[PDB]
């Protein structure tokens, strides 16, 4: 399935001048050092995650640091990410900073949780360290970016623990003696993230790498007509397709799901079933060995008739917010709490985060104020509590809320932006606002007030993907075919 498919995370490394000076000002040494670290992290990820981290590019500042460098991991991470947004433009799934400034914190590297495949969130910062040390830090940070984090609630409950009890696991504080195995909850979080639609940009094979043309490296690069890998593992997959980076008499493929038994599969086959309603099934082009590019519902499309919205391919509901923030057993409360707590109250219902004078929420809409769920546990899966978890009690409901934080300034305790409040009514700056606030673009439509001429759904690339037997770009002409 989609999980079993080989993910390809396009990573680019940004390097500051501190470790450049520490490496005797050598460009080539830093380049090969980054290549070795990338290879080591890929070897880590290949055992379980089945994900190859392709070092698409790397930048090292031989001159000096462009922006302010501080020992605070959060401030330095923000500066690196804003520098990436301002200057870095090349397509890359993850943008990771090797921080020469060794952070004065207790955590090795600072990476956003579930932030991969994002312009302002796709990557993290890894501090200076030993080759293995920063390789482990990069592995932890990339696990963070793909939503793989140590589960605090399961740690307290003992639901899942590190099977490498010798020296702990990678997700925890980086001990000197590195382990070799990830926990099963790491992989479970990976399936949950991929099924949610996150990390959809990791399914592309780059054609250009920092590595010279190497036969059997697992990627069809420049100068290689086909690549089935080393013949040791080529027997299982693509045995007759490609041999020694060369075709076997009459052939059309090397690997890939869209090409079964080294031959082209029939047209219309689904090489990737949609994970949810936010995902769009991918069909092979009929002449491309690799599966179709990942396409999801455009940002603003609802998971259901009214409730829920797909952002970046990930569904968002109040119930989904409670599940991500608090836990699976925790579900969003009814409108009763929303209209009985957000209207007036301290620490119970608040629109904006103001400890002194809490922001009042109007009765027109109360679905963007304090996030209220049902049966909130002792501790959330991720984040921290700003004080104590708020608890509030003809129908009786167990009403609860909190102020779950994160490594970013954004507060997960409130309702995340874009959560629906009604018809085209979704959160923006802790308030229900229409689509005009977000200024969502209109896809290729021919009628009035429709999407892709009514029948058809626009993908994430703002391009229409018409339905069956609709070859027109704007879903206007019918072309029967067999």
């Amino acid at each position: 399935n989609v999980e079993e498919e080989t993910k390809y995370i396009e990573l680019m490394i940004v390097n500051d001048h501190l470790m450049f000076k520490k490496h005797r000002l050598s460009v080539v040494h830093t380049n090969t050092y980054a290549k070795s670290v990338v290879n080591m992290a890929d070897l880590i990820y290949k055992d379980q995650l089945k994900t190859r981290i392709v070092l698409v590019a790397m930048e090292t500042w031989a001159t000096d640091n462009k922006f302010a460098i501080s020992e605070n991991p959060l401030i330095t991470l923000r500066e690196f990410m804003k520098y990436r947004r301002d200057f870095i433009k090349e397509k890359s799934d993850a943008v990771h900073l090797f921080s020469g400034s060794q952070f004065e914190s207790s955590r090795s590297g600072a990476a956003y949780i579930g932030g991969i495949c994002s312009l302002l969130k796709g990557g993290g910062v890894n501090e200076f360290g030993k080759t293995d040390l920063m390789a482990v830090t990069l592995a932890q940070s990339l696990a963070h970016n793909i939503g793989i984090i140590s589960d605090k609630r399961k740690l307290a409950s003992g639901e899942c623990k590190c099977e490498d009890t010798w020296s702990g696991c990678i997700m925890g504080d980086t001990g000197y003696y590195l382990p070799k195995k990830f926990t099963q909850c790491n992989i479970e979080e990976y399936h949950d993230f991929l099924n949610s639609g996150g990390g959809a940009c990791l399914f592309n094979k780059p054609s250009k790498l920092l590595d010279p043309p190497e036969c059997g490296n697992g990627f069809i690069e420049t100068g290689e007509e086909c690549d089935c890998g080393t013949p040791a593992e080529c027997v299982l997959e693509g045995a007759e397709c490609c041999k020694k980076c060369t075709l076997t008499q009459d052939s059309q493929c090397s690997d890939g799901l869209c090409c079964k038994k080294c031959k082209f599969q029939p047209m219309g086959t689904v090489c990737r079933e949609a994970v949810n309603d936010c995902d769009i099934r991918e069909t092979c082009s009929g002449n491309s060995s690799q599966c179709a590019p990942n396409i999801h519902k455009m940002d603003g499309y609802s998971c259901d008739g009214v409730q829920g919205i797909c952002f970046g391919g990930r569904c968002k509901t109040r119930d989904r917010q409670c599940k991500y923030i608090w836990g699976q057993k925790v579900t969003a409360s009814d409108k009763y709490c929303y209209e009985k707590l957000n209207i007036e109250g301290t620490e119970k219902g608040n629109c904006g985060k103001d400890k002194d004078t809490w922001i009042q929420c109007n009765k027109r809409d109360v679905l963007c104020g304090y996030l209220l769920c049902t049966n909130i546990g002792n501790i959330p899966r991720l984040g921290e509590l700003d004080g104590e978890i708020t608890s509030t009690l003809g129908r009786t409901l167990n009403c609860s809320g909190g102020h779950v934080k994160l490594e970013e300034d954004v507060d997960l305790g409130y309702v995340e932006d874009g959560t629906p409040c009604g018809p085209q009514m979704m959160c923006l700056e802790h308030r229900c606002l229409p689509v005009a606030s977000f200024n969502f673009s209109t896809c290729l439509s021919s009628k009035e007030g429709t999407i892709c001429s009514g029948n058809g759904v626009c993908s994430n690339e703002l391009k229409c993907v018409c339905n069956r037997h609709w070859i027109g770009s704007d879903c206007n002409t019918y072309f029967p075919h067999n």
């Binding site: 207790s106 040390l133 009890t165 504080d173 001990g175 000197y176 003696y177």
Partner: protein, 259 residues
């Protein structure tokens, strides 16, 4: 006459067991704090000014190196020393500094990719203060000292990088000799039968035995042993016999009677 053994585990924290001189049973005298002590790497114990202090370092960077009293105290009871950095190994020694006339206690804190730190047991602060750096190189793994004719000679050991045996001189050390590292995660000096030897491990060679040359003042190749993954060396002398234990991380610990 009450043994307080420090039983430290990478999981579940550490404990201090008390061995009764009568029942010979090890009862946990002090459950040491586990909030900072999670993955211990090395513990160094010493007594000074009739105060028993032991140094704790965590293989994880979160757990900071700290010195604790024999009974057992909290996070930073009397001093903090090295924190927010790497904590790998610590070694206690006694060297004569330039300012102080008498013998002055010190600690050496070696850390991965971090400069080793000298710590003077300053009596004015009564703490292991004066965090400084040796002028030799970066990323030294292990450290241990000894005294040859009053002059202190100490080991600055790296796993692959050429390790050093270097002489103390009052403010910093003065270089004496350098020897190759071929898988020596440890290099421990010893004094057996009044003979100054030193053992460098070899994860990727035959472990090497140096004897202090009484004439060249340099550690010449004395002998070559073969031990599975050496990690530490510890010597005993009972009656008229001497024995040495060579630890083994990936196999059986070796034992050699010094004859």
């Amino acid at each position: 006459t009450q043994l307080y053994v420090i039983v430290a585990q990478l999981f579940g924290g550490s404990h201090i067991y008390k061995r009764d001189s009568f029942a010979n049973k090890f009862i946990k005298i002090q459950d040491i704090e586990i909030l900072k002590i999670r993955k211990p790497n090395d513990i160094e114990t010493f007594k000074i000014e009739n105060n028993w202090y032991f140094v704790v370092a965590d293989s994880s960077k979160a757990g900071f190196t700290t010195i604790y009293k024999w009974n057992g105290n909290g996070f930073y009871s009397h001093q903090s020393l090295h924190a927010w950095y790497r904590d790998t190994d610590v070694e206690y020694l006694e060297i004569v500094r330039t300012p102080q006339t008498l013998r002055t206690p010190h600690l050496i804190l070696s850390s991965s990719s971090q400069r080793p730190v000298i710590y003077q047991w300053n009596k004015a602060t009564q703490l292991f203060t004066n965090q400084t750096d040796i002028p030799n190189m970066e990323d030294v793994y292990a450290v241990k000292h000894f005294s040859v004719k009053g002059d202190v000679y100490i080991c600055l050991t790296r796993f692959i990088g050429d390790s050093k045996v270097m002489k103390w001189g009052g403010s910093s050390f003065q270089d004496i000799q350098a020897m190759p590292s071929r898988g020596s995660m440890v290099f421990q000096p010893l004094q057996i039968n009044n003979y100054q030897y030193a053992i460098l491990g070899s994860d990727y060679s035959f472990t090497q035995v140096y004897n202090w040359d009484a004439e060249k003042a340099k550690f010449v190749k004395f002998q070559e042993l073969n031990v599975q993954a050496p990690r530490s060396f510890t010597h005993v002398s009972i009656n008229k016999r001497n024995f040495l234990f060579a630890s083994s991380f990936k196999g059986n610990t070796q034992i050699y009677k010094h004859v």
